[PDB]
Amino acid sequence: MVGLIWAQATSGVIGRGGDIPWRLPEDQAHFREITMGHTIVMGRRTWDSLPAKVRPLPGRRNVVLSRQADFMASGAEVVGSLEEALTSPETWVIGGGQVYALALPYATRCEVTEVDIGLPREAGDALAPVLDETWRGETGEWRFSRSGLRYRLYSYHRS
Numbered sequence: 001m002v003g004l005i006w007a008q009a010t011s012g013v014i015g016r017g018g019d020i021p022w023r024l025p026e027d028q029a030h031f032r033e034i035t036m037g038h039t040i041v042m043g044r045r046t047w048d049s050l051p052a053k054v055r056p057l058p059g060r061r062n063v064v065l066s067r068q069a070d071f072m073a074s075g076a077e078v079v080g081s082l083e084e085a086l087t088s089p090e091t092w093v094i095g096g097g098q099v100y101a102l103a104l105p106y107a108t109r110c111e112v113t114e115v116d117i118g119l120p121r122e123a124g125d126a127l128a129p130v131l132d133e134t135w136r137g138e139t140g141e142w143r144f145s146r147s148g149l150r151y152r153l154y155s156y157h158r159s
């Protein structure tokens, strides 16, 4: 099973300037619950976005995708191809925009947090991948984050 997990603004923006223009503690908790114990695969830019004190994310096989053959990610595996990373029973692709697009053909689950923030797309933004007709969606109720933004969870599945 390869799953994708991300939070997006209602516009589809997931990243800006190399980071994220929001932070919902509830979404962090959900992210931790879904990924804990499993493989997590991220692009090198997303690895760079993690503070050194926090990586590798604990209790998970951290894998970083890079074209640089000698890129060092202390506490992670660095691979040059996404296929190399898909050997565990449950693999979560945790971003960013480029790696979501690369991983979508392998994916059968998308855990999507929609953040009710009015954030028009801009050049350079990282975006959520486009889900075509093969994906079946299940929608959660709107919730209030203690950060003051509403959010809801979508669970997309396909065979």
Ligand SMILES: NC(=O)c1ccc[n+]([C@@H]2O[C@H](COP(=O)([O-])OP(=O)(O)OC[C@H]3O[C@@H](n4cnc5c(N)ncnc54)[C@H](OP(=O)(O)O)[C@@H]3O)[C@@H](O)[C@H]2O)c1
Pocket: 005, 006, 007, 008, 014, 015, 016, 017, 018, 019, 020, 042, 043, 044, 045, 046, 047, 049, 065, 066, 067, 068, 071, 080, 081, 094, 095, 096, 097, 098, 099, 100, 102, 126
């Ligand atoms: N849920 C969220 O909202 C969420 C979650 C994660 C990240 N983000 C955001 O997403 C943004 C980063 O996304 P990104 O799209 O800019 O970068 P990315 O997908 O995080 O990583 C891109 C890098 O991955 C490597 N890569 C990409 N395609 C490759 C390929 N075909 N073969 C080998 N290596 C490849 C390259 O590394 P080298 O340059 O080392 O070759 C490339 O520079 C940040 O803003 C981050 O905060 C958001």
Ligand SMILES: CCOC(=O)c1csc(C)n1
Pocket: 007, 027, 028, 031, 032, 046, 094, 095
């Ligand atoms: C944003 C939802 O969950 C997170 O806190 C998180 C950990 S690592 C990463 C790229 N995002």
Ligand SMILES: [Co+2]
Pocket: 033, 034, 035, 036, 037, 038
């Ligand atoms: Co699990």
